[PDB]
């Protein structure tokens, strides 16, 4: 399926997975027309949550609870295939996606934000490995931009340990979250 | 019998929504479609929306934090 | 040329034209740079503007200095045809543009602002005699949203006037200021 | 020689909405074309993009109140 915005397949994705048992049928068209007016308006789905939340008096900090929600797999990127190296693929996915979104939890103490960061690197080169292992075109270009936002989320860190702006660095974990699940769904769509 | 939600949020809010897309972007018919898919979804299933809603909220509430 | 979204011609187009003078050609690479960018992501204008605003520890309400904004003539919704009606039509446009740009102005005290409330639908009634005689297809639905737009700006004065949220009241006459533009622009392109 | 807005203020900027753009809606090649349009104008003309952004300033401080 087709690569969609964060909120979507973060925040209402797993929604519209849960609303299954409740009816397929209606679940199936809400998801569906969620991605279609998504497509035809880039943010609106984030624009509909934070109004809702807004309406119900629900108050939060977006883009550091998108951080945690972007930890679920996405099962539409998952990889189907049976085979050692792809679901290897899926799982070094998984627990790079999974260690960042443990951020917002550590980030304001510093040594157990310290080690998070070792956890990351190592989930990173981790992930590199395995998907430089599996190139058995459009592949090493997503790998190039995976290896770009890692080096960007690194020019991130130090900069937040100049300033400590903590946002910035939620903002950049997000987008190698979205380029890891980007990697995901390019080698399953080719 | 149908949802609360219909009326006090998917209304107003994909009106705000609908104003916003068709003065700027231009095509506000799949936002539209959204809107009535709601309504499609609550005659195939009465309360779906406002479980929606729930899971909404329930999930953001989940991994929200101070 | 083509409707572009309101923080564009109403915020950006001003400062173009007010840099021709400086240098014709960058002013318009600027501008026809700014068109295509905010046609590929529509929205972008604004972000631009209020991430500017934000650096330079400029603090405004966007939306209300907006609507003082777009009382403002727009250059290339302007008929330039010299026979009486269209001319008429410029005007009747830019007097519910500037009246409507009021607002702001006027909402805090009750007796001016239903005295600008007034001279609104004295300007609307206006514009609309104006538009139904200039008519000599899409222009009829043009005119019904127009129509449309009044009746919900009116509403919404209502609602106002019961709850006392001015933002909304902003956003509105936001609305029928584009919807002006909108008719003048489609009776210049046809 | 040149204006300082282009590191101070452009290039931040362009790269935050790059950013917010590519993960979203897809298409980032006109944004930075408008980025590039700034480069080009100022060296066209030194110093119109200080003049740009002054405009802008002026315009949103003019019809600005409380």
Excluded: W
């Amino acid at each position: 399926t087709s690569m969609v915005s964060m909120p979507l397949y973060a925040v209402m994705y797993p929604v519209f997975n849960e609303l299954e048992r409740v009816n397929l049928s209606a679940a199936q068209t809400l998801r569906a027309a969620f991605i279609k007016a998504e497509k035809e308006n880039p943010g609106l789905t984030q624009d509909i949550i934070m109004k809702i939340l807004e309406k119900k008096s629900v108050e939060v900090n977006f883009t550091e609870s998108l951080l945690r929600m972007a930890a679920d797999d996405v099962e539409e990127y998952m990889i189907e295939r049976p085979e050692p190296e792809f679901q290897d693929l899926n799982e070094k996915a998984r627990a790079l996606k999974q260690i960042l979104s443990k951020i917002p939890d550590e980030i304001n103490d510093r040594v157990r934000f310290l080690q998070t960061i070792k956890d990351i690197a190592s989930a990173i080169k981790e992930l590199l490995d395995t998907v430089n292992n599996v190139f058995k075109r459009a592949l090493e270009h997503q790998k190039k931009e995976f290896v770009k936002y890692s080096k960007s989320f690194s020019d991130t860190l130090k900069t937040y340990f100049k300033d400590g702006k903590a946002i910035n660095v939620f903002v950049s974990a997000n987008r190698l979250i979205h380029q890891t699940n980007l990697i995901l769904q390019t080698f399953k769509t080719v | 019998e149908f949802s609360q939600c219909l009326s006090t949020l998917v209304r107003p809010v994909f009106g705000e929504l609908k104003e916003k897309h068709k003065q700027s972007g231009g095509s506000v018919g799949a936002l539209e479609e959204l809107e009535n898919a709601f309504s499609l979804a609550e005659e195939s299933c009465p309360g779906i929306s406002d479980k929606l809603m729930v899971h909404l909220v329930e999930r953001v509430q989940r991994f929200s934090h101070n």
